[PDB]
Ligand SMILES: [Mg+2]
């Protein structure tokens with residue numbers, strides 16, 4: 084028989100990995116934040132002469148050779164390559180020996196908003212140029228958005244939970260929350276969890292341009308400017324973040340080095356507009372409150388907010404309103420999309436890494452680029468330079484296309 | 498403060514909705530099963546002259562006019578239309594008054610494996626024929642796989658959890674399991690949950706043909722033949738199933754009519770091959786056992802298995818092996834993909850409806866088409882005609898591309 088009651092478990096972070104426009108190790112990634120070096124510049128992945136958008140945050144130095152060989156491009160779109168690299172880096176960082184685990188209690192969640200969209204565009208064209216017999220056998224294994232999760236599970240022998248979650252910009256915030264809840268409620272002992280996106284393509288840029296969602300600002304240093312009066316759309320980035328989560332008991336029993344604790348998760352829905360956030364941040368308020376309630380902390384204990392902060396007029400008006408409503412005007416807020424661009428399905432995972440690293444360095448990274456915050460924005464937006472401070476608890480927001488709100492609360496470790 | 502312990506809740510089904518190749522109401526859908534009328538025939542959605550596959554299970558009578566008007570095609574791909582129709586039908590069936598609910602405790606999960614893939618193919622072509630300025634503004638709101646969930650939430654004012662899950666063929670089995678766990682652990686009181694797919698398109702058929710995953714059998718009555726010695730690939734279907742799940746307390750307090758109870762969920766990963774299931778069903782065995790353990794039932798109590806049963810050599814060899822290993826050679830097994838085709842991300846939701854309807858009618862639907870089961874298959878495969886019997890508990894399997902195994906256990910209600 085099963086018990087009537089479940090005794091809750093604590094959940095800790097033991098390692099992480101990243102490939103991104105500002106670095107491919109936590110040390111490189113943090114150094115960019117601490118020195119004020121952004122990753123936005125002119126697009127190089129395709130000819131963008133006919134577009135209205137000419138900037139993106141690219142990974143121009145992906146360390147392909149560390150783990151892969153040429154034949155791996157037959158099997159993996161970049162959206163999977165990025166996840167596999169970040170997952171191996173996270174396993175290494177955690178000093179996790181996957182051959183010593185209970186593999187039935189080891190799971191994987193790899194979120195993505197769009198999946199292998201380069202593969203889709205290129206094979207649609209091949210179909211219509213050459214006919215159906217010439218579509219590549221590996222088209223769907225490369226393209227379908229769940230495949231990165233299955234690929235990561237195969238690499239590490241994870242026989243437990245394996246899934247992908249899609250909530251657009253919230254996808255990897257929801258992934259980390261779901262993995263946290265799995266471990267908290269006793270289903271798994273170890274989860275590799277995060278997100279990945281590789282959507283700097285003609286089609287995906289054209290689609291977001293058609294939605295009027297992208298900044299058309301020519302100067303790459305003035306294009307991603309969250310909370311700034313001149314903001315006018317997001318700048319697309321690419322990459323992956325992956326975290327190792329463990330039960331506290333599992334981590335301590337094996338002598339792991341613990342990097343942070345996950346303590347709360349809030350997920351709500353605006354049920355308001357298909358792509359615009361609620362203008363007063365109504366769903367965002369409720370998501371923040373849920374995360375704090377689960378973590379058993381008061382608003383005054385939150386010492387940093389890593390904002391969703393995509394650099395749109397509507398987003399930061401509501402998001403500042405939501406943060407002020409729940410937490411007030413003193414808590415420091417910054418958006419690191421000013422450095423990384425908008426990583427879409429990978430945004431929550433990379434921003435969880437930002438938040439953990441901020442707690443471990445006693446340092447709130449600035450919002451790069453921003454100079455003049457809108458008059459009506461009442462939140463304590465950090466810009467110009469970062470802030471030295473103790474950060475015992477912090478939250479990271481994502482408020483995504485489709486109305487999906489997700490907030491994670493983290494606690495500094497001992 | 499939060500408790501140290503969570504008191505578990507029971508979870509019940511109060512309504513469901515369906516659009517599918519064998520019907521667009523539970524009554525039509527069941528009647529097709531009870532009379533032996535399949536939904537597979539020649540493709541009509543595109544010119545398939547150049548293809549090797551000429552059959553599919555289409556919805557050729559979608560009741561567009563019941564809820565939609567012409568302008569809705571500007572906003573919604575068919576993958577969202579199908580989900581919105583099935584969700585409204587489920588709400589109606591449940592006699593759920595969405596204006597009387599706690600909307601913060603009302604959530605939505607709409608699974609999909611591929612999302613608005615017609616929109617993607619058609620707008621890729623527009624991009625390359627006319628240039629980026631001519632890509633339609635609603636391209637990504639129509640295409641992205643999370644949008645159906647957000648659309649359903651907006652229709653009903655669901656302000657709680659809103660997400661999409663992608664585990665290919667397992668997507669809506671995992672969706673229903675996730676919603677079940679949310680309610681069981683006290684996060685939500687009511688969830689609208691299921692899946693949707695609209696992938697009978699040149700691109701998606703060409704992709705599955707290139708994977709060698711589709712039956713090339715010309716006779717539509719011999720193409721989807723799960724467990725049969727002549728099986729040679731799946732037949733693609735389309736549509737959506739949506740269920741209303743409630744806590745037992747919420748359902749009884751409002752005087753709902755209860756249709757079934759959800760009692761267990763097992764999710765594991767083969768971590769074996771990217772698209773082929775483990776040949777001996779090793780991950781499937783563990784997923785079945787997890788569902789039974791959570792439901793607190795013994796193997797002998799399972800009275801029907803709705804198989805994954807896609808009509809591939811490798812699938813049914815391992816799946817029969819897994820069923821025999823855990824449950825033995827007497828429990829009746831049938832695959833209704835013989836009627837509906839493979840609904841991909843919608844398969845688990847429509848098959849949950851099959852399973853519930855079987856329990857409510859005291860009737861195991863047959864596997865249509867199949868005549869001669871492979872010599873090595875030891876499971877009690879029902880074919881030729883369905884079986885009259887009491888079904889107090891039942892399970893439904895999905896074992897999807899990427900290694901994702903999901904099993905749901907249901908209990909008949911009082
Ligand atoms: Mg660098």
Ligand SMILES: [Mg+2]
Pocket residue numbers: 389390391434479480481
């Ligand atoms: Mg954030």
Ligand SMILES: [Mg+2]
Pocket residue numbers: 519520521525558
């Ligand atoms: Mg009919």
Ligand SMILES: [Mg+2]
Pocket residue numbers: 803804805848893894895
């Ligand atoms: Mg099934």
